[PDB]
Amino acid sequence: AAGTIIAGAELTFGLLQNLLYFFANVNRKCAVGVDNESGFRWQEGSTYFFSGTADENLPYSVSDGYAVLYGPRKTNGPVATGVVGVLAYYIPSIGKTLAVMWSVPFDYNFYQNWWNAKLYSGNQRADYDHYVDLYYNANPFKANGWHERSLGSGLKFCGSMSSSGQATLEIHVLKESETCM
């Protein structure tokens, strides 16, 4: 009789409210710090997201001795996806664009935190081709403490990423004749 179906509805929507509340209350976050000590002005700050969003703007420019601070997070409500995105700036003193990438996935059973950076030719704002090149075609870093690499064109970077689901990411971008932190 229909009393079984009504009790089945109370169980069904009782479980569904808790399942949607669980996916809404799992936090994935990133906090990206990119210190410019490269000796060049950076400008035209741009972004892309494969997943997640940021509430604030970038600085339009980053003069010598100042830092980008920028805080992505997961898409809000019951959607089960993480943060994955790109950041970029153009460096008119050297004719190239710095790009930075990170990932902080939702499902850690198949994925892990990653980051990368490159200095591309000309002016090209962050997009899906920069994501696929920084994440698949280049050699990305995993999130386990400090890594250092040349960008070419007289510049290098040294940086690290936390392995946490709420990840801090830090990069110092600097001249090849200088030492980090």
Ligand X SMILES: CCCCCCCCCCCCC/C=C/[C@@H](O)[C@H](COP(=O)(O)OCC[N+](C)(C)C)NC(=O)CCCCCCCCCCCCCCCCC
Looking at the Cβ atoms of 82 and 159, the one nearer to ligand X is 82
CB 172: neighbour CB atoms within 10 A?
22
CA distance 87 to 22: 30
**Binding to ligand X (CB under 6 A): which residues in 2-61?**
26, 53
Nearest to 155 by CA among 67, 65, 36, 46: 36
Nearest distance, CB of residue 67 and ligand X, angstroms: 25
R_g of the chain computed on alpha carbons: 20
Task: Report what 162 binds from a second copy, ligand X, none; CB cut-off 5-8 Å by kind.
Answer: a second copy
**Binding to ligand X (CB under 6 A): which residues in 146-175?**
163-165
Query: What end-to-end distance do the CA atoms of the chain give, in Å?
Result: 72
| 124 part of the interface to a second copy, by CB under 8 A | no
Give SS3 for 130.
Answer: helix
Task: Report what 78 binds from a second copy, ligand X, none; CB cut-off 5-8 Å by kind.
Answer: ligand X
Q: Which of 95, 129, 145, 175 binds a second copy (CB under 8 A)?
A: 145
**Binding to a second copy (CB under 8 A): which residues in 80-119?**
none
